[PDB]
Design an enzyme around this catalytic site. Structure first.
Site, PDB file in Angstrom:
ATOM      1  N   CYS A  29     -25.059 -18.504  10.247  1.00 29.58           N
ATOM      2  CA  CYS A  29     -24.369 -19.467  11.153  1.00 29.58           C
ATOM      3  C   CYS A  29     -22.884 -19.136  11.298  1.00 29.58           C
ATOM      4  O   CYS A  29     -22.227 -19.831  12.087  1.00 29.58           O
ATOM      5  CB  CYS A  29     -24.550 -20.915  10.711  1.00 29.58           C
ATOM      6  N   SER A  44       3.914  -1.236   7.931  1.00 31.68           N
ATOM      7  CA  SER A  44       4.279   0.134   8.350  1.00 31.68           C
ATOM      8  C   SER A  44       3.520   0.510   9.638  1.00 31.68           C
ATOM      9  O   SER A  44       3.795   1.563  10.163  1.00 31.68           O
ATOM     10  CB  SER A  44       4.087   1.139   7.210  1.00 31.68           C
ATOM     11  N   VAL A  49      12.435  -8.984   3.530  1.00 36.51           N
ATOM     12  CA  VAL A  49      11.991  -9.856   4.649  1.00 36.51           C
ATOM     13  C   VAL A  49      12.408 -11.285   4.281  1.00 36.51           C
ATOM     14  O   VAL A  49      12.826 -12.035   5.143  1.00 36.51           O
ATOM     15  CB  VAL A  49      10.493  -9.655   4.945  1.00 36.51           C
ATOM     16  N   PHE A  64       0.850  -1.219   0.000  1.00 36.76           N
ATOM     17  CA  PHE A  64       0.000   0.000   0.000  1.00 36.76           C
ATOM     18  C   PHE A  64       0.874   1.253   0.000  1.00 36.76           C
ATOM     19  O   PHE A  64       0.492   2.196  -0.682  1.00 36.76           O
ATOM     20  CB  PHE A  64      -1.017  -0.051   1.146  1.00 36.76           C
ATOM     21  N   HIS A 114      -8.082  -8.030   8.562  1.00 35.13           N
ATOM     22  CA  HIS A 114      -8.745  -7.247   7.495  1.00 35.13           C
ATOM     23  C   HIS A 114      -9.504  -8.171   6.550  1.00 35.13           C
ATOM     24  O   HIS A 114      -9.973  -7.658   5.542  1.00 35.13           O
ATOM     25  CB  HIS A 114      -7.727  -6.366   6.748  1.00 35.13           C
TER      26      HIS A 114
HETATM   27  N1  LIG Z   1      10.305  -7.418   0.630  1.00 34.33           N
HETATM   28  C1  LIG Z   1      10.116  -6.531   1.612  1.00 34.33           C
HETATM   29  N2  LIG Z   1      10.854  -6.657   2.734  1.00 34.33           N
HETATM   30  C2  LIG Z   1      10.652  -5.805   3.748  1.00 34.33           C
HETATM   31  N3  LIG Z   1       9.794  -4.796   3.839  1.00 34.33           N
HETATM   32  C3  LIG Z   1       9.048  -4.722   2.732  1.00 34.33           C
HETATM   33  C4  LIG Z   1       9.152  -5.502   1.602  1.00 34.33           C
HETATM   34  N4  LIG Z   1       8.227  -5.075   0.659  1.00 34.33           N
HETATM   35  C5  LIG Z   1       7.602  -4.081   1.231  1.00 34.33           C
HETATM   36  N5  LIG Z   1       8.076  -3.804   2.472  1.00 34.33           N
HETATM   37  C6  LIG Z   1       7.556  -2.804   3.408  1.00 34.33           C
HETATM   38  O1  LIG Z   1       6.285  -3.289   3.762  1.00 34.33           O
HETATM   39  C7  LIG Z   1       5.570  -2.235   4.437  1.00 34.33           C
HETATM   40  C8  LIG Z   1       4.109  -2.540   4.292  1.00 34.33           C
HETATM   41  O2  LIG Z   1       3.377  -1.397   4.730  1.00 34.33           O
HETATM   42  P1  LIG Z   1       2.054  -0.878   4.010  1.00 34.33           P
HETATM   43  O3  LIG Z   1       2.281  -0.834   2.525  1.00 34.33           O
HETATM   44  O4  LIG Z   1       1.631   0.305   4.800  1.00 34.33           O
HETATM   45  O5  LIG Z   1       1.089  -2.108   4.346  1.00 34.33           O
HETATM   46  P2  LIG Z   1       0.394  -2.687   5.693  1.00 34.33           P
HETATM   47  O6  LIG Z   1       0.324  -4.174   5.575  1.00 34.33           O
HETATM   48  O7  LIG Z   1       1.069  -2.037   6.837  1.00 34.33           O
HETATM   49  O8  LIG Z   1      -1.036  -2.044   5.479  1.00 34.33           O
HETATM   50  C9  LIG Z   1      -1.993  -2.042   6.558  1.00 34.33           C
HETATM   51  C10 LIG Z   1      -3.360  -1.928   5.942  1.00 34.33           C
HETATM   52  O9  LIG Z   1      -3.451  -0.667   5.248  1.00 34.33           O
HETATM   53  C11 LIG Z   1      -4.156  -0.856   3.985  1.00 34.33           C
HETATM   54  O10 LIG Z   1      -5.041   0.192   3.737  1.00 34.33           O
HETATM   55  C12 LIG Z   1      -4.818  -2.234   4.110  1.00 34.33           C
HETATM   56  O11 LIG Z   1      -6.028  -2.249   4.838  1.00 34.33           O
HETATM   57  C13 LIG Z   1      -3.747  -2.992   4.903  1.00 34.33           C
HETATM   58  O12 LIG Z   1      -4.250  -4.173   5.522  1.00 34.33           O
HETATM   59  C14 LIG Z   1       6.098  -0.937   3.807  1.00 34.33           C
HETATM   60  O13 LIG Z   1       6.593  -0.054   4.813  1.00 34.33           O
HETATM   61  C15 LIG Z   1       7.257  -1.401   2.890  1.00 34.33           C
HETATM   62  O14 LIG Z   1       8.409  -0.605   3.011  1.00 34.33           O
HETATM   63  O1  LIG Z   2      -2.284  -5.522  -2.239  1.00 36.50           O
HETATM   64  C1  LIG Z   2      -3.333  -5.148  -2.721  1.00 36.50           C
HETATM   65  N1  LIG Z   2      -3.520  -4.249  -3.714  1.00 36.50           N
HETATM   66  C2  LIG Z   2      -4.885  -4.151  -4.062  1.00 36.50           C
HETATM   67  C3  LIG Z   2      -5.455  -3.390  -5.066  1.00 36.50           C
HETATM   68  C4  LIG Z   2      -6.826  -3.470  -5.233  1.00 36.50           C
HETATM   69  C5  LIG Z   2      -7.616  -4.290  -4.421  1.00 36.50           C
HETATM   70  C6  LIG Z   2      -7.039  -5.051  -3.411  1.00 36.50           C
HETATM   71  C7  LIG Z   2      -5.663  -4.976  -3.240  1.00 36.50           C
HETATM   72  C8  LIG Z   2      -4.752  -5.636  -2.304  1.00 36.50           C
HETATM   73  O2  LIG Z   2      -4.958  -6.411  -1.400  1.00 36.50           O
HETATM   74 ZN   LIG Z   3     -25.042 -20.900   7.348  1.00 31.39          ZN
END
Ligand SMILES: Nc1ncnc2c1ncn2[C@@H]1O[C@H](COP(=O)(O)OP(=O)(O)OC[C@H]2O[C@H](O)[C@H](O)[C@@H]2O)[C@@H](O)[C@H]1O
Ligand SMILES: O=C1Nc2ccccc2C1=O
Ligand SMILES: [Zn+2]
Ligand SMILES: [Cl-]
Length: 285
Positions: free
Chosen positions: A138, A203, A245, A58, A127
């Site tokens: 159910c 993040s 990661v 994101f 989420h």
């Molecule tokens: N290969 C990698 N290795 C390490 N870090 C990584 C890599 N690729 C990406 N990153 C880091 O991965 C981080 C991912 O942060 P974000 O993108 O905010 O995602 P969330 O999972 O926290 O999003 C939370 C919710 O927000 C949404 O609206 C949805 O509802 C989500 O569920 C970044 O800081 C990258 O630098």
């Molecule tokens: O990582 C994602 N990127 C997206 C773009 C559109 C709809 C859902 C998602 C994800 O879950």
């Molecule tokens: Zn049912």
């Protein structure tokens, strides 16, 4: 079907940090030491563990929100259905199987933890899950082989088959929707009781998901943050590892004497097993 307006999408596009190799190797050995010392290790995952599968995050440089803010589109190198779990996904499977992971809390809706074979009774999908529909009546969940084609807890078209004909709905939270109580309570309990919470590719900007790792610090818990970018709670981390990661988890599994198991293709495990044998612990102190 993903909003661009009334949603505050936090800080997007911050610069990446790369720990130099010698500092990365030392920090992953310290993470090893911390796993070995820990009674109860909870892992927190976000969209950064799926980027190496082709799924954009994101808020990274090419994240969904980052690109929308500059009038560009995110790019998918895969469908959700064709996405393979990463080395990170599979490392987390093995850590649960050898009894070194107590609980997995994920903000990801990409369904890959479940398709990786990770036991669902040790996973909170805060989420929701693209592939999971739930009976309104159910509450019976169905893990499908294809993405459930709606979002925001809407009727999918299909009905319950439990010996009900209840309306089947997606599990994908909209901005306004509360977290599922069952998952959030279990994530919350796992996090308060943890003596080590490791965050991977999140993040930590979204309440309450991104605050759960902080709950561990109460009662003297250790927090480790693996992330390429800064995170809301970097300040409260005992260890921050700025690296891919997959590299961190591959070096960690090597230090733990654990192999990263093969992915057989999409499999669903409901319940965790007693732990498999694991290597004996190094002398630390
Ligand atoms: N290969 C990698 N290795 C390490 N870090 C990584 C890599 N690729 C990406 N990153 C880091 O991965 C981080 C991912 O942060 P974000 O993108 O905010 O995602 P969330 O999972 O926290 O999003 C939370 C919710 O927000 C949404 O609206 C949805 O509802 C989500 O569920 C970044 O800081 C990258 O630098
Ligand atoms: O990582 C994602 N990127 C997206 C773009 C559109 C709809 C859902 C998602 C994800 O879950
Ligand atoms: Zn049912
Ligand atoms: Cl898809």
């Amino acid at each position: 079907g993903i909003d661009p307006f009334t949603a505050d999408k936090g800080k997007c596009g911050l610069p990446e940090i790369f720990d130099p190799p010698e500092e990365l190797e030392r920090k992953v050995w310290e993470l090893a030491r911390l796993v070995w010392q820990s009674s109860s290790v909870v892992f927190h995952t976000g969209a950064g563990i799926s980027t190496a599968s082709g799924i954009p995050d994101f808020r990274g440089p090419h994240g969904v929100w980052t690109m929308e803010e500059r009038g560009l589109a995110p790019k998918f190198d895969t469908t959700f259905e064709s996405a393979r779990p990463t080395q990170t996904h599979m490392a987390l499977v093995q850590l649960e199987r050898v009894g070194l992971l107590r609980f997995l809390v994920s903000q990801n809706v990409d369904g890959l933890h479940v398709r990786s074979g990770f036991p669902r009774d040790k996973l909170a999908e805060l989420h929701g899950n693209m592939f999971v529909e739930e009976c309104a009546k159910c509450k019976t969940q169905y893990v499908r082989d294809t993405v459930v084609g709606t979002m925001g807890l809407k009727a999918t078209g299909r009905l319950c088959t439990v010996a009900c004909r209840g309306e089947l709905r997606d599990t994908i939270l909209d901005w306004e929707d509360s977290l599922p109580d069952r998952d959030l309570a279990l994530a919350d309990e796992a996090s308060r009781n943890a003596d080590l919470s490791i965050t991977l590719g999140t993040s930590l900007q979204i309440r309450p998901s991104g605050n759960l790792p902080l709950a561990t610090k109460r009662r003297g818990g250790r927090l480790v943050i693996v992330n390429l970018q800064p995170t809301k709670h970097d300040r409260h981390a005992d260890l921050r590892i700025h690296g891919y990661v997959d590299e961190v988890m591959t070096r960690l599994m090597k230090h733990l004497g654990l192999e990263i198991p093969a992915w057989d293709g999409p499999r669903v495990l409901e319940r965790a097993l007693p732990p498999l044998p694991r290597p004996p612990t190094p002398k630390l102190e």
